[PDB]
Amino acid sequence: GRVKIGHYILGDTLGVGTFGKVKVGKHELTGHKVAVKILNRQKIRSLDVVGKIRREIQNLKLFRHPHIIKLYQVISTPSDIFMVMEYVSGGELFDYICKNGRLDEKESRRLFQQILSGVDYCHRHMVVHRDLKPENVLLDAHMNAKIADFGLSNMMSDGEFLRTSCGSPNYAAPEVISGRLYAGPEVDIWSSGVILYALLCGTLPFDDDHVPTLFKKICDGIFYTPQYLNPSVISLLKHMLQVDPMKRATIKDIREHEWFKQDLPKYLFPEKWHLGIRSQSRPNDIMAEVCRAIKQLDYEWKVVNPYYLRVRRKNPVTSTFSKMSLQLYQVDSRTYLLDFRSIDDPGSHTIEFFEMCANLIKILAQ
Amino acid sequence: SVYTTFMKSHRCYDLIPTSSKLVVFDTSLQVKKAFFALVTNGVRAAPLWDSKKQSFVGMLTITDFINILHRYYKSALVQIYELEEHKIETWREVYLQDSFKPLVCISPNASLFDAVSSLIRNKIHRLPVIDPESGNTLYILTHKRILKFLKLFITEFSLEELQIGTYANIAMVRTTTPVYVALGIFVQHRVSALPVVDEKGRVVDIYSKFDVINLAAEKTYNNLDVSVTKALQHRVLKCYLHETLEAIINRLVEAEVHRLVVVDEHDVVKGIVSLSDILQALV
Amino acid sequence: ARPTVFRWTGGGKEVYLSGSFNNWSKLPLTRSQNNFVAILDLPEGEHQYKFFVDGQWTHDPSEPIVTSQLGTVNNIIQVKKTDFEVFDALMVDSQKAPPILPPHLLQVILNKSCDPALLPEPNHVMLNHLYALSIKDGVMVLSATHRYKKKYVTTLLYKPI
Ligand SMILES: COc1nc(N(C)C)ccc1-c1cc2c(C(=O)O[C@@H]3O[C@H](C(=O)O)[C@@H](O)[C@H](O)[C@H]3O)c[nH]c2cc1Cl
Ligand SMILES: Nc1ncnc2c1ncn2[C@@H]1O[C@H](COP(=O)(O)OP(=O)(O)O)[C@@H](O)[C@H]1O
Ligand SMILES: Nc1ncnc2c1ncn2[C@@H]1O[C@H](COP(=O)(O)O)[C@@H](O)[C@H]1O
Ligand SMILES: Nc1ncnc2c1ncn2[C@@H]1O[C@H](COP(=O)(O)O)[C@@H](O)[C@H]1O
Ligand SMILES: [Cl-]
Ligand SMILES: [Cl-]
Ligand SMILES: [Cl-]
Numbered sequence: 099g100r101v102k103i104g105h106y107i108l109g110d111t112l113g114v115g116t117f118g119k120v121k122v123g124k125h126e127l128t129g130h131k132v133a134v135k136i137l138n139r140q141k142i143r144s145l146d147v148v149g150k151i152r153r154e155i156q157n158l159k160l161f162r163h164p165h166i167i168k169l170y171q172v173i174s175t176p177s178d179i180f181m182v183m184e185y186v187s188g189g190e191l192f193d194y195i196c197k198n199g200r201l202d203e204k205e206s207r208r209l210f211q212q213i214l215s216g217v218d219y220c221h222r223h224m225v226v227h228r229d230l231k232p233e234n235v236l237l238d239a240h241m242n243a244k245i246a247d248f249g250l251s252n253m254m255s256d257g258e259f260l261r262t263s264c265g266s267p268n269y270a271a272p273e274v275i276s277g278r279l280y281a282g283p284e285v286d287i288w289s290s291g292v293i294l295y296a297l298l299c300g301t302l303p304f305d306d307d308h309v310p311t312l313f314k315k316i317c318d319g320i321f322y323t324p325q326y327l328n329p330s331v332i333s334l335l336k337h338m339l340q341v342d343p344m345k346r347a348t349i350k351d352i353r354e355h356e357w358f359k360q361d362l363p364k365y366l367f368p369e370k371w372h373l374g375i376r377s378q379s380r381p382n383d384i385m386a387e388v389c390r391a392i393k394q395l396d397y398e399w400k401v402v403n404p405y406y407l408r409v410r411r412k413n414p415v416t417s418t419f420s421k422m423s424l425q426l427y428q429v430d431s432r433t434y435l436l437d438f439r440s441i442d443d444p445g446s447h448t449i450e451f452f453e454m455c456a457n458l459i460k461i462l463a464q
Numbered sequence: 465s466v467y468t469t470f471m472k473s474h475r476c477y478d479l480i481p482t483s484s485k486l487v488v489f490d491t492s493l494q495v496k497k498a499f500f501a502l503v504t505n506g507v508r509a510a511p512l513w514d515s516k517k518q519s520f521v522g523m524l525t526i527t528d529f530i531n532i533l534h535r536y537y538k539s540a541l542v543q544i545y546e547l548e549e550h551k552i553e554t555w556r557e558v559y560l561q562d563s564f565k566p567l568v569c570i571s572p573n574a575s576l577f578d579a580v581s582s583l584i585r586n587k588i589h590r591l592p593v594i595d596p597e598s599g600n601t602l603y604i605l606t607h608k609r610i611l612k613f614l615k616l617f618i619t620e621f622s623l624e625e626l627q628i629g630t631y632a633n634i635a636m637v638r639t640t641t642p643v644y645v646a647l648g649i650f651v652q653h654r655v656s657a658l659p660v661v662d663e664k665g666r667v668v669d670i671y672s673k674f675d676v677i678n679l680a681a682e683k684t685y686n687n688l689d690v691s692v693t694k695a696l697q698h699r700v701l702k703c704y705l706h707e708t709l710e711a712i713i714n715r716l717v718e719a720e721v722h723r724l725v726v727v728d729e730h731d732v733v734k735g736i737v738s739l740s741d742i743l744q745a746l747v
Numbered sequence: 748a749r750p751t752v753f754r755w756t757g758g759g760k761e762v763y764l765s766g767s768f769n770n771w772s773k774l775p776l777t778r779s780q781n782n783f784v785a786i787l788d789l790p791e792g793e794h795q796y797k798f799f800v801d802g803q804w805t806h807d808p809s810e811p812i813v814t815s816q817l818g819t820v821n822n823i824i825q826v827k828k829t830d831f832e833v834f835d836a837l838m839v840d841s842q843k844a845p846p847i848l849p850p851h852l853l854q855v856i857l858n859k860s861c862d863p864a865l866l867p868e869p870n871h872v873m874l875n876h877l878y879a880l881s882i883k884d885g886v887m888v889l890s891a892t893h894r895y896k897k898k899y900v901t902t903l904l905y906k907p908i
């Protein structure tokens with residue numbers, strides 16, 4: 099009377115992931131242990147994440163990094179979807195930091211290099227694992243880091259930003275807690291910086307029971323540096339925990355940092371213009387001005403957000419459809435700018451895009 | 465046949481740099497603004513887009529400037545009225561009257577040998593790399609770049625004896641020769657550079673098609689009466705026939721020049737060996 | 748042939764699964780909490796089943812049923828080929844103020860010796876976005892960075908108006 103999927107006998111629940119329970123699986127014959135994420139088909143469609151799971155499975159299937167949990171196979175049934183992945187005995191890195199204290203400089207450095215190697219592999223593969231925390235970093239029998247919950251991860255697409263505020267407030271970046279738009283990698287660097295602090299101190303750099311003061315502390319970027327902390331790592335933490343994403347460290351900046359470089363194993367790494375047009379009018383006036391000009395050019399469109407437009411044009415020569423995306427952003431407390439983005443599908447696609455923009459610019463403000 | 469096979473394998477895409485800049489002019493653009501744009505953007509050639517035709521019709525180079533200048537110059541006392549007020553299409557209609565020429569281009573997926581042969585076949589120095597799926601121009605393939613990659617593979621894996629290039633009926637200028645006259649020679653002979661000779665046959669300097677953009681840059685094009693030397697005051701590699709072809713190819717890329725002048729024992733001109741000839745022999 | 752999950756969501760001391768697929772033999776279901784389950788291989792076709800929850804016979808009301816000529820009410824299952832393959836199953840399953848300008852878009856590669864033809868590698872985020880120069884002397888200069896395979900090209904068009 100044992101529950102079986104594949105040839106693994108399903109056992110104890112390891113935890114409850116982003117979209118389902120994760121149970122241990124022990125092979126009938128070999129005794130090999132796996133972790134099985136159970137996704138109920140009817141539940142994943144309820145909280146419309148069918149696309150999220152489709153992508154998540156697609157990515158994790160082609161990944162292969164020694165510090166990211168391997169997805170061995172996906173077993174599908176009429177009722178549920180079973181994600182069979184590699185099992186690690188050591189459990190949460192968080193629990194390790196709870197039971198034992200803070201890790202020593204050498205220990206912390208080792209684990210941080212491993213975690214960052216994985217965070218890098220993800221980014222290199224245009225995948226940004228939002229929700230990066232010690233609770234999601236698992237340890238194996240030999241104390242090796244293993245990134246695990248890709249439920250809140252997302253794709254990095256050429257020319258687009260992400261909005262979704264994902265992780266735990268303590269690990270979330272200021273722009274994430276501020277619900278502002280982000281590129282992706284910077285928010286993982288911030289989270290990794292908090293993971294590094296957790297490793298060296300055994301506590302959180304930004305933590306308060308009073309949620310508003312916690313959010314202020316994060317956006318102010320001010321955190322305590324204990325006396326035992328080596329100035330060189332304080333330097334790295336300062337560079338990683340920058341409230342300005344443009345002033346914040348990149349994997350390359352970290353890779354180049356003298357504290358990170360130390361004892362770093364070989365195997366870990368493989369080595370007068372203006373944007374659009376700015377108009378000081380009211381946001382909806384700008385939207386009325388653009389729509390009346392788009393139709394004036396006889397271009398087709400679809401209104402996504404009240405400030406997002408997906409415009410199409412029929413070429414009178416090549417008889418080809420050329421499409422672009424228009425988005426209005428707020429610059430100052432006084433000005434707003436309209437952004438033009440070409441959407442990928444004869445003559446030149448790129449030049450056809452410029453002519454499309456130029457026409458609309460001629461009938462518009464600054 | 466050793467290097468010849470190597471070119472037939474490698475795709476054009478392999479030579480496109482990681483991050484490039486491409487300048488494109490709409491045919492309706494005023495031609496003076498177009499040359500000044502080449503100068504300001506630091507680009508030697510720029511493809512042309514016909515808005516009505518919705519396709520790349522041709523390319524604007526320094527030869528176009530040499531052609532306008534010589535064809536329409538009157539004196540330093542009068543403006544080159546046409547150059548001042550002429551569109552790229554208006555001039556391309558005059559330049560290519562009955563004698564019409566279409567656009568020569570290569571796909572990034574096409575081989576290096578396909579591109580080298582296309583340079584000599586159409587008698588051209590600048591070749592646009594256009595992706596057929598997108599229709600977008602990506603990079604402009606030059607002899608200097610192709611011979612740079614082939615020099616890296618030559619290292620890892622005589623001039624009179626082999627006899628490579630043109631050595632007879634050489635087009636040259638004197639120290640005192642006016643710019644207008646030199647521009648005329650560049651037109652009738654269809655050559656990239658004119659070697660500057662002294663009182664005797666000895667070579668002192670070299671005025672090239674490139675040195676003509678300085679007239680556009682410094683806005684000194686209205687006076688073509690000035691001597692070739694006077695024009696070259698805004699800023700000479702010579703080879704002998706007792707030197708090996710591999711050492712001749714090595715000396716060229718070491719200074720990154722478009723051609724080498726064949727000089728005798730008494731510094732006098734005997735012939736010329738250009739990047740067009742080296743790549744012709746290795747095909 | 749294809750694995751099928753049989754889950755009873757309720758309480759119980761003992762729950763069994765009877766079906767056409769096992770000659771209506773009482774198969775016991777393992778309990779986690781308020782769920783009783785059994786995963787078993789089924790031949791892709793029609794199968795009828797019932798539950799023996801603590802001395803009482805029942806069907807799962809949320810699952811499809813079939814009332815018989817004799818008045819028997821059993822649950823029914825139609826095992827599909829699309830149910831067994833991941834992406835086939837996921838394909839069938841799928842059936843205010845303006846945002847603040849991200850600082851990333853202000854980081855141009857055109858403004859930031861060397862070669863004028865060459866430019867720095869751009870952040871994916873600023874690709875396909877239109878940048879422009881101020882219309883000086885009635886001529887518009889438009890520029891954008893796009894990527895062809897593993898390489899990037901910043902095309903700038905000089906267009907009059
Ligand atoms: C008894 O079930 C199991 N026992 C096993 N062992 C080791 C005895 C092994 C696997 C399962 C199993 C569980 C589930 C499942 C599940 O537990 O879903 C939960 O149901 C709860 C509920 O309805 O009360 C909600 O609260 C909650 O969110 C939601 O995850 C969904 N689909 C499944 C498919 C299988 Cl094979
Ligand atoms: N792809 C092309 N198709 C047609 N004509 C071209 C093309 N590229 C250049 N031309 C023409 O070739 C002629 C010579 O140019 P070129 O050899 O490129 O000069 P440069 O020595 O400055 O590089 C010019 O009249 C120019 O318009
Ligand atoms: N000064 C020159 N006189 C005669 N032929 C030349 C001269 N310069 C170049 N050539 C020839 O013109 C062809 C194209 O060379 P180039 O335009 O210099 O890249 C080659 O066959 C050269 O040998
Ligand atoms: N044979 C040569 N020896 C030395 N400099 C040369 C030679 N040919 C051309 N140049 C220089 O190359 C520049 C012209 O560029 P290009 O036509 O691209 O080779 C000028 O600065 C010339 O002085
Ligand atoms: Cl959990
Ligand atoms: Cl066990
Ligand atoms: Cl283990």
Ligand SMILES: [Cl-]
Nearest residue numbers: 195296300301
């Ligand atoms: Cl902690």
